[PDB]
Amino acid sequence: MLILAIISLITFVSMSKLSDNRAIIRLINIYLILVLVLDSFLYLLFLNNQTYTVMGELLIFNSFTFYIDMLIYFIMIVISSLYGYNLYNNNLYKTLFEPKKELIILFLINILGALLIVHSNDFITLFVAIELQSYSIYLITAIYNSSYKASKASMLYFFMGGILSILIAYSINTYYSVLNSYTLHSLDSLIINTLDLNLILIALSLGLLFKIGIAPLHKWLISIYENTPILITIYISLIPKISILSYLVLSNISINSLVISILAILTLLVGSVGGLLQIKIKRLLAFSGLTNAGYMMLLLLLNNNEFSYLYYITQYSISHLAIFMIIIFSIYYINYINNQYNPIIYVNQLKGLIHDNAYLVLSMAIVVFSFIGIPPLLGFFGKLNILMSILNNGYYFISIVLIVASLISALYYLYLLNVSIQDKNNILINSNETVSSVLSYILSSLIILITFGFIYNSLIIDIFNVYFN
Amino acid sequence: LPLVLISLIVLTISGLMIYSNDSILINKLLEAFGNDYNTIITQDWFNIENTTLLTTIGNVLLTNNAFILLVLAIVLLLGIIGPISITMKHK
Amino acid sequence: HFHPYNTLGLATQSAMVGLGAGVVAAAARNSLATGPRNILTTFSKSGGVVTIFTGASIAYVFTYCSAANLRERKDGWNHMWAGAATGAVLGARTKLVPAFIGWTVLCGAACGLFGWTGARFNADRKASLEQSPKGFVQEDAHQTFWEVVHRRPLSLTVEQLGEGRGINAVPIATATEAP
Amino acid sequence: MFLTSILLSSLYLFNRILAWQGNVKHFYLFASNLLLLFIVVLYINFNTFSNSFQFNFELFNSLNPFGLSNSDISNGLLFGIDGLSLTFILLTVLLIPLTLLGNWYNINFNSNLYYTLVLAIGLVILLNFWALDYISFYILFEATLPLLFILIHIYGSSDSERASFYVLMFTLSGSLFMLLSIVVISIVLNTTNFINHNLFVLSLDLQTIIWLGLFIAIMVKTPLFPIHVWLPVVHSESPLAGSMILAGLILKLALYAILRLLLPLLCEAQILYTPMIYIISLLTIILTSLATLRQIDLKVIIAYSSISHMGIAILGVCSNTSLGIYGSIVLGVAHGFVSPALFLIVGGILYDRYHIRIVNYYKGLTTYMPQLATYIIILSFANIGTPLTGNFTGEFLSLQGGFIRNPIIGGISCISVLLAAIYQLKLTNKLTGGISSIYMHRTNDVTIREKFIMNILIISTLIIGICPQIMYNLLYWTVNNYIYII
Amino acid sequence: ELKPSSAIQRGPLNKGGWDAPHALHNDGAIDRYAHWRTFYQERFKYTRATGKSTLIFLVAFPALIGYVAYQSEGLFEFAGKRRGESVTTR
Amino acid sequence: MFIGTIILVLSFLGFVFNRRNIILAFICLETMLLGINLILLRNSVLFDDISGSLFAIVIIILAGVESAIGLSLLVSYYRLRGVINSYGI
Ligand SMILES: CCCCCCCCCCC(CCCCCCCCCC)(CO[C@H]1O[C@@H](CO)[C@H](O[C@@H]2O[C@@H](CO)[C@H](O)[C@@H](O)[C@@H]2O)[C@@H](O)[C@@H]1O)CO[C@H]1O[C@@H](CO)[C@H](O[C@@H]2O[C@@H](CO)[C@H](O)[C@@H](O)[C@@H]2O)[C@@H](O)[C@H]1O
């Protein structure tokens, strides 16, 4: 039903004016909500890990992928509410947070390309869908074209995505040159013994992984995440991560991988010690993505990782989405707005935040202790259930390096708190205009999932016991 | 120039490596060069119509992989919408 | 049991490998740099990388093989001594004594903690929980690693802990019986 | 419907007291004082004749996520007490109003924040002693640290920032390896539980690994010599209630965790390692109590004193003796009485008045404050191991139990009676005597609230000192429980 | 052209309350002394005296008390004793 | 496999060591894609199937749309800055 949305939408956007664009996104927001509500019941198809293959050995549908599908729709309902709703009714925030005409077009085409990977069985479905989502990230980066940094970032992202698309294509055709086959379904655990498919499947994994931000090739993605504006970057950070990783976690082609294990160690090291002496908030906030994409590369080495993965996915997605939404709200309280596309940059700009909207600091605290892994919060059971899979399966040096990486990464997480709970000379006493009710309810909902979401751990596991076993 | 020469040697040899499946690394490379045997082409009279190659592509793009043609239509659509949407400057 | 090592053979193999890694990293340092650089500044403005790779390789594998040969067993301590030698080579580049002592002690402790977990980045297949016998013993047997029981043999307690402290081969009660 | 209507009534009453009174601190005192009444009524209905866990309740079960659960299958979070838990709960709950009392006039700017954080920390360390899973012990073991970080950072000395960092850093960094060990237990046994876990036996090579991860966390939290490092600065730059709740309750929480978590299922490990614990225990009694002598600051001395007393405490725990276990409990409870009174004397009566904690300013406090000097001496002598105070009962039975297990470690462990007296009386005679200081202008005598806190925290040492049998009715099961003498 | 909005009216932050008069004449020498003593670790450097104390208290003393502790595990009972009865197990 | 691998490796190194302009980087990308095509088309001919020819005729179109998209990205890059640098973006 994304197809019908795109086909209806681009015809509808061709006829609307510029001033209509905002309200169009509101429509699409509600549309996606009634694809969650009125169409969820398809989970009843997937009892006892019954898997389907649709369109003839082409798309594989299990309930792992159904959950990834539902997660991607939920986060788009959020991101679409960020574009489609005003923050305040000022003359300021209309020229700072304003959608383009064709923005929601590229959004839905991107989600289409990201779903056709997690649902994918074939390799040409994999390649066409990676190409579709890669074009969409090209154009979502370059759509705010009256910005020097965003155009430079779109060009950088074009060439570095072109190399790692031709590396994937070379790995697919290298796999074809030794097996007249397109599926990893053909592998079926006898062939891997008598066939040297190490170097092929590992090179395929790498060419898929370097697009995430794994650490030998991590600098260019941190540059794109700092150069893009503040609304584009909470989408292009989240979507290729969860799409490409839930591809590679579903098909288990790097087990006992020594190369994935080196790159997981190297990722947890230079992500935690990378973002220490840094002063820009999107930088600081983009090396948090490097370490938390490091905790996934561990699970690639695993067999049977579908609990640790999915729980830590929706953990990172809610925590991610919430900490980006908080520093949208701190823009009213800063004393200095530069750079219209990216209005808050330096992390010392949110300094007096406890004396002006103290419960924004309560919100910020609750989400940032969840990144560290504090046990009343939902981030801790995510790190816990990763640890239960790492220690089960023989990765003992990986585990202590995970722990040292978590301890180093707590420093620049707590730097946000250190800066936020400080004295400020000039405090706000009263504000005329207040924040959007339907948009601040989303942040309150995203906290109450993080705070009081350890409640349902038991229920989820029992539901997890039925539909995946 | 020195990283050029090192990468020429390594990337060339290692591109020639994965066409082969001995566990020993030197036996992987030499199987790249043992091609001088001439394949024998035999005439089989089993085919009755001039299905060319383009006919078979049009049968497999359209029945077995029709969805790939249709997702490909979405990609061609994107290749229209994108360059336009950048280079408009609406109003 | 074990097999002794060829210190000279493994040392010269590692010396060739460290020479190769030094040449590759020197070329990568030239080509990723600024300023006037030519073909001959590979080993001129090298920053001394080939000495790093060469000394670290030779010292680690020579101390590892020598410590494994004089102890006549292979465990995690040999990685500690070899990592101490690696820290000695890396710490002599900073020509200071307390620096040098710190590099030796902390690199040896980190490499010993590495070599004690198996000295492997990846996993071991037979040793992990998932591929090993677990749970209770089904009948009475030698309780292997990863297995739980209810009662342990007391002869094993005397053999493993000792015959001393509060621990005896006979409980203190029936050692003091009226007949 | 009934227990929901109680909460819908009490939250409404809370909102109304907020709307009419700006502070809450009256309602917080009222709530914590009611918690006292409730826990002592639980003490009346407590059966001492059963080793059992008497008052059990499950939270967050599958079939009932919001509330109590009566099902044949349990995967939530278990809670309940024996005697051993309940003693600390008593020592917990009578401390909680006093810290809520302890800052009744100091905090002026943001009252409701500070009193909410202090009461919330106290409630979390209430529920620490109720827990029965390994995970439900550990979830609340680390619920404290955000509240402690926010408390130490916002309020404190000029150096609030570094102290709040260290109380996150070292405490976290030890607790992570504790979590490693908890995970390794939870994937072998497939059950975290404080009930069954003495029944299971692990391999000696497998107990050998698990025990290091728990023991280095207890090394961090009862600060033994390798990491005894955050303790003086997180005291010396804390506010008052954070320092009291820390040194009265968090250190005794890790003294409880070495009993509850390690001594039941690491027994055959634990015998092989008692000399390593005795190395570190003697070496943290000698070398921290010797570093007390060279101190310029005044709250820092009472901090290192707490290190030396916990170093005495843990060699009764690992003593494999009835005497040592009972002496460690009576030391832990009596130090939880006597030590927050000392942090009051340095922090409440002496930092609220002069706002500088350097020792060199303070001389001759007797001639302008006689009854403060009276306190300073009788709380000094109660700290050392001067008897009829309960601190000596803990020190004596702990040194005796440590002399059982190894006599030569007890011989040099016994000189702690000397080393604990040297710095404490060296501080006491500098504060008590001399001509009154030219730097200090004369201020008020000790007020009624401070004398109230002091009188309670001194009677409660003297009752345990005159008769330590008053709480043997809880422990006589749990003194026999942890002993492994085949 | 981007300035934070006009409807702020932000005011100064006090800490509130009563100006408690100075009960203490601070000494410059004592304050500089104590600030030097608490922050000693940021100017600490290794010398021969540091090496001597770091050798003897962190390495030599744990090894000595270690050897004494591991030798004397199950040697001594004195629990019920007699003349002519050895008290060492060994 | 020699012609496709040599076109791919030489085009890849010419892309990497490009410091002179940007249109050489685009055309090195397209010559890479040609090399991957050549390797696959030969593998289709040697294995007697259209299967790799199916992946070939799809990746022809995807190389096309990659050119169209990315050259519009370059026109967007050039719109604000009336010259393209020699050293790169
Ligand atoms: C919390 C503080 C931090 C502690 C870090 C932990 C790391 C401690 C590692 C200890 C541990 C994992 C257990 C850890 C589980 C808890 C993990 C806690 C958290 C993890 C972060 C890895 O043990 C490693 O020890 C190393 C040396 O010590 C060895 O190094 C290497 O040596 C050379 C040999 O070939 C290599 O060739 C060389 O390449 C290396 O030099 C490795 O062989 C070995 O894998 C033990 O595993 C092993 O124990 C043995 C017993 O003997 C078990 O055999 C059992 O017993 C026998 C019949 O009784 C029978 O043989 C068998 O029938 C039975 O199976 C195994 O089952 C196995 O499982």
Ligand SMILES: CCCCC/C=C/C/C=C/CCCCCCCC(=O)O[C@H](COC(=O)CCCCCCCCCCCCCCC)COP(=O)([O-])OCC[N+](C)(C)C
């Ligand atoms: C009328 C329909 C209402 C529309 C509901 C739409 C929800 C979209 C949201 C997606 C992400 C939010 C997390 C949802 C968790 C579902 C768990 C599940 O059940 O997941 C299980 C297993 O999960 C996993 O592996 C681990 C995921 C763990 C989630 C961690 C977050 C916990 C806190 C939030 C959950 C509790 C909040 C309840 C508040 C009252 C399989 O998924 P399933 O196939 O059983 O899907 C169920 C079909 N349901 C949605 C229609 C019922």
Ligand SMILES: CCCCCCCCCCCCCCCCCC(=O)OC[C@H](COP(=O)(O)OCCN)OC(=O)CCCCCCCCCCCCCCCCC
């Ligand atoms: C934020 C950190 C993460 C939080 C994870 C843990 C969440 C804790 C949430 C607080 C709620 C727990 C306390 C209330 C649950 C117990 C209420 C109860 O009814 O206990 C039932 C128990 C037996 O009752 P029953 O079996 O039904 O039979 C009755 C026959 N007369 O009756 C009894 O045995 C008496 C039980 C006494 C319980 C005393 C607990 C002391 C602390 C109470 C306040 C706790 C609030 C802490 C808030 C901070 C959050 C940690």
